RNA sequence: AAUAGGGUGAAGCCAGAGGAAACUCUGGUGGAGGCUCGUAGCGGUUCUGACGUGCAAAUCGAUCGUCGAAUUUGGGUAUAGG
RNA sequence: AAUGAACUAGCCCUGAAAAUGGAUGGCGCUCA
RNA sequence: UAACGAGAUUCCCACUGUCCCUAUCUACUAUCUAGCGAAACCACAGCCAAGGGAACGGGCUUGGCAGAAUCAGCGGGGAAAG
RNA sequence: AUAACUGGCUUGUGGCAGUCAAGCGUUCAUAGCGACAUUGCUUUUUGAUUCUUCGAUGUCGGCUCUUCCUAUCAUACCGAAGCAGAAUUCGGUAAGCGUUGGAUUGUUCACCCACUAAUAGGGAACGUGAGCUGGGUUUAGACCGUCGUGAGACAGGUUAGUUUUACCCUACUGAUGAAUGUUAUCGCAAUAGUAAUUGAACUUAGUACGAGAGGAACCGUUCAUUCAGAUAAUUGGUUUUUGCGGCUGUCUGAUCAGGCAACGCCGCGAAGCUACCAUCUGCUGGAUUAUGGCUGAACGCCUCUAAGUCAGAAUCCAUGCUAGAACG
């Protein structure tokens, strides 16, 4: 729940982030994000924020192997804010959820975006610093 | 075969032919409809593209996300000094279209607006307009006889206008005429206001008011000979293809045995006529202030023009229009500011804007400072203030 | 809405202008151009580049 | 008649060490090989690149195989249409 | 002050969906 | 089956405009000019829709229509050329 | 005179739609289905045939791009139910608008993974090779298996195998232009084109409905997807600004200042161009379809229909937008 203005995309399907939750997952490759429509040849691509489908490419056996929902939590991308702000984080990462938007783990390495923040509140309630 | 995969059409269809405009000024297609109970007005105002800026504003939607904040936006600087009134030209309705009755013009024009009937003014006489000015010096009998026809007949009435290009840094001496409609009394109420005006000025704040939606007319920026990869937004065909890649690979069936117009096909781009509407005024600013470029919040003492002044434009010295994001044409381009066709009711037409800053530094470069002051006072003493 | 400061540079920094970066220590970073951000992803010490707040006042200039 | 510059380091030889013996171990030296990286040279993999009424009835650019021998090549000479 | 059932067969309607725009030859025609 | 392989194949790391999704830049062309100056091909020629027809017409029949001279491109058609 | 494509006739076979109503459907043929039979339609399957082409119509698939059909997957509005709600199913007007990203396979096909409002089906010489590609098929090299005494065979397998030309005509896209007394400025508007699309969250509301479990919608608010038209504030990309600085080798005796490295190399780099890699902008009136109604006969009753008439869809015509007839 909620309504984030549109962001600079910067995870097509294909892309590996680094997981940032104590699930015991390491990695985390997109292979598909939620909302995307139809466009031939357009690959589908997360923002900060967005849900997406991921496995685990390392990390813990019992968590590998499967298909999971995820929540991008930063990207290196640079992307604008409404207040005209151009910012971007050093690494691409998410965080292994519920369908419901729920973490897994239950901490959280590093700074979370605000937008990402904003729209999921457990993710919120886990996060330290938030940019 | 059907296609294998569907995608939507390249391109508009609607924007045909992509051709170069017929004139450099754009005309206006269509006029706001007449009412008959308002006062008397203006419905359009020619000014010139000088350039653009970054504002600072608090966004008033409840329910929005960035309500009561600030947001940074693009905003576009129009030159519009006043124009003059030089004459009014009656409209009769007829089975086969508007159709002009009659025209009617002031005992002196300007030798700016009268450039504007020549082709080499250099070498003319300066003929123009030379034994017309005598059917006012014997009485105007005949002049005010012409306007009575237009009272009588006429159903719609516009008023004939120039720019004072020569209070803009523009090299072009010959000013831009043009047909302004009349809207609100009733045809004489009309005719009256339009000679009341003959060589008069009318500014842009008669027209204008703040907060309003106003829409532009422009010819767009020139592009020459295109291919189809840029001019309609096709795939590029794989590395590997002989020939070459930037193309429609099929331009069509066998049947029908004819290249179809809805394909892409390469040609001219850029340089179109275009109608854009809903900009909001952001600021009427006036010539003789000082501070132009200051608000409410930002006290410094400022004009609107940028450091070093508007990149390929010069400075705007007189009255402006402060407008929301971008509008159709370039840099020195004449454009034609229109009021709105209809009644808009949403947040975005009826919020109050207050700004509160315009940036000011150079658009030359990666301009820090918003001042010569700010920057002597950052910098501090140099070796050529000794 | 208030002025920033570069990071690395120490010129001003209005609205819109630049970028902001987030290290991986959640340190954040604030340049005013595309030079000042090239500088510092090279590494380059701000104190050892002469037209630097960080320089000039280093080197009692002013 | 011709064939840069490197790498590796075969037998043989010198010295030392161990061992009851049989023998073994270490450091040098030496400079073997249809060995190897890589020029000239010889060849011709891929771009299915250029060209494709060509510079050219087989070429051009890059990329590439090989490069001390079953190597490359001039001249002389022999084999002639079932 | 006429009405009820079953049925017969004329014109008309339904049954009657394809790819470029288009063919009672065309225009058009309705006590034709 | 060690070694070797411009041989065929699968996966991984690195790497990248192969792609998402395109943008920008340089040289030589193309372009315009002075000079010079070919060839392929050519029944006659050259706008469409339907019909009928050697059953997919530029020409025939019925319609739509139709205004000199042209330049850069283009690859639908000429069931184009070889 | 005759096969291997397309096209033509045919339509068995493939595909789609009707008629009847034995049964199923807790009772009830027809809400939804529907046996035994039987009438058709289509040309997106495969055959049958041999009319056209053998002084040659380039012979798979994909990629790219446009357009058409409707037998409608979604989106608009509706009728029906074994429709309480939610969900779903049957049907009508409707082709205006969309219909995706991937693993394996040369594949069409098939099959999974995933997103989605939805992942409908088809045509255009089985659209599309002087548009490409060349993995497959289908010349010549080579290997295997089975067959053959052998040369060799094989809708059996495998590996390597040159993809030519446009400068003509037309078409298309853009661009000039004679003639209309001359020249200039401002206009009108026939005709042609046309554009927007879909979703989520909040609110309504834990409300209506429901024993419960569950669980809507209209008005409204904020965003977003696909598309379209611009623009260059900003941020990013780009550098012969060869603008500034740095670096190697060598040359001008050294210094200074320079030359060359078939733009020598590196950092920054304005301007210009440009990106859902950036920002802005995308209108409102009328008439209808399906359908639901009013009054109202025919036919003393009834009936939305016969006369008349009201409302009403992503439809249509306008408004608005693009061009402006080069013989208005
Ligand atoms: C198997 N039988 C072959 C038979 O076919 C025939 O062979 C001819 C051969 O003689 C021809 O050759 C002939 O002509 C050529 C040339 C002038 O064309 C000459 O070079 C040659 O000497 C002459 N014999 C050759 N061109 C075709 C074969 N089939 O001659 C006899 C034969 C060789 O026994
Ligand atoms: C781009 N990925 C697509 C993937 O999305 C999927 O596409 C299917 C497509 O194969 C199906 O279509 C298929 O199946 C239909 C049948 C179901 O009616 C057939 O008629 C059709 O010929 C066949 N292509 C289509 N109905 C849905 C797509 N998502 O499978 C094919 C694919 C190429 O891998």
């Known amino acids: 729940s909620g309504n984030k203005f549109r962001m600079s995309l910067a995870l097509p399907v294909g892309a590996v982030m680094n997981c940032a939750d104590n699930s015991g997952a390491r990695n985390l490759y ?16 997360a923002a900060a924020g967005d849900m997406v489908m991921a496995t685990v490419k390392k990390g813990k056996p019992e968590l590998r192997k499967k298909v999971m929902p995820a929540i991008v939590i930063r990207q290196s991308k640079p992307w604008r804010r409404r207040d005209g702000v151009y910012l971007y984080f050093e690494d691409n990462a998410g965080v292994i959820v519920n369908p419901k938007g729920e973490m897994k783990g239950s901490a959280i390495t590093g700074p979370v975006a605000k937008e990402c923040a904003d729209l999921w509140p457990r993710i919120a309630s886990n996060s330290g610093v938030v940019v | 075969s059907h296609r294998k995969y569907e995608a939507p059409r390249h391109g508009s269809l609607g924007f045909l032919p992509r051709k170069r405009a017929a ?39 409840p329910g929005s996300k960035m309500h009561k904040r600030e947001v940074v936006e693009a905003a576009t600087v129009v030159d519009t000094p006043p124009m ?18 009659t025209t009617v013009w002031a005992e002196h024009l300007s030798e700016e607006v009268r450039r504007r009937f020549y082709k080499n003014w250099y070498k003319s006489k300066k003929k123009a307009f030379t034994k017309y000015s005598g059917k006012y010096a014997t009485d105007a009998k005949q002049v005010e006889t012409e306007l009575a026809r237009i009272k009588k007949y006429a159903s719609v009435v516009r008023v004939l206008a120039h720019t004072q290009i020569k209070k803009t840094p523009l090299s072009q001496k010959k000013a831009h005429l043009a047909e302004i ?18 060589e008069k000025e009318v500014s842009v704040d008669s027209v204008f008011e703040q907060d309003e939606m106003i829409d532009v007319i ?24 002989h020939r070459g890649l930037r193309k429609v690979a099929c331009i069509g069936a066998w049947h029908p045995a004819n290249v179809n117009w809805t394909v892409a096909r390469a040609g001219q781009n850029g340089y179109h006529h275009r109608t854009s509407i809903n900009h909001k005024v952001y600021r009427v600013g006036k010539g003789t202030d000082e501070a132009n470029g200051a608000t409410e919040f930002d006290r410094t003492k400022k004009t609107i023009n940028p450091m070093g002044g508007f990149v390929r434009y010069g400075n705007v010295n007189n009255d402006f229009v402060l407008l929301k994001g971008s509008i159709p044409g370039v840099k020195k381009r004449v454009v034609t500011l229109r009021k709105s066709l209809y009644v808009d009711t949403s947040r975005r037409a009826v919020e109050k804007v207050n700004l509160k800053w315009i940036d000011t530094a150079s658009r030359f470069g990666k301009g820090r400072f918003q001042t010569p002051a700010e920057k002597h006072a950052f910098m501090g003493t140099l070796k050529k203030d000794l | 809405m208030k002025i920033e400061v570069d990071s690395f540079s120490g010129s001003k ?50």
């Not at chain 2, 009349?182 to 000679?195: E, H, P």
């Not at chain 3, 902001?20 to 510092?40: H, M, P, T, Y």
């Open chain 1, 30 to 45: 997109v292979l598909a994000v939620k909302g995307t429509g139809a466009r031939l040849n357009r690959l589908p691509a």
């Open chain 2, 23 to 61: 004139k450099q000024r754009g005309r206006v297609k269509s006029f706001p409809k007449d009412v008959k109970s308002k006062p008397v007005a203006l419905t359009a105002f020619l000014g010139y593209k000088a350039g653009m800026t970054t504002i600072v504003r608090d966004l008033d939607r």
């Open chain 2, 84 to 101: 003059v009134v030089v004459g009014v030209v009656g409209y009769v309705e007829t089975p086969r279209g508007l159709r002009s009755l």
């Open chain 2, 181 to 198: 409609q009349i809207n609100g009394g009733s045809v004489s109420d009309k005719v009256d206001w339009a000679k009341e005006h003959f």
């Open chain 2, 218 to 241: 422009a010819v767009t920026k020139g592009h020459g000979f295109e291919g189809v990869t840029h001019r309609w937004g096709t795939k590029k065909l794989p590395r590997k293809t």
């Open chain 3, 13 to 62: 920094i209005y609205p819109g202008r630049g970028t902001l970066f987030v290290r991986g220590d959640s340190k954040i970073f604030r340049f005013q151009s595309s030079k000042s951000a090239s500088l510092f992803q090279q590494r380059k010490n701000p104190r050892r580049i002469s037209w630097t707040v960080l320089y000039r006042r280093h080197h009692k200039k002013g």
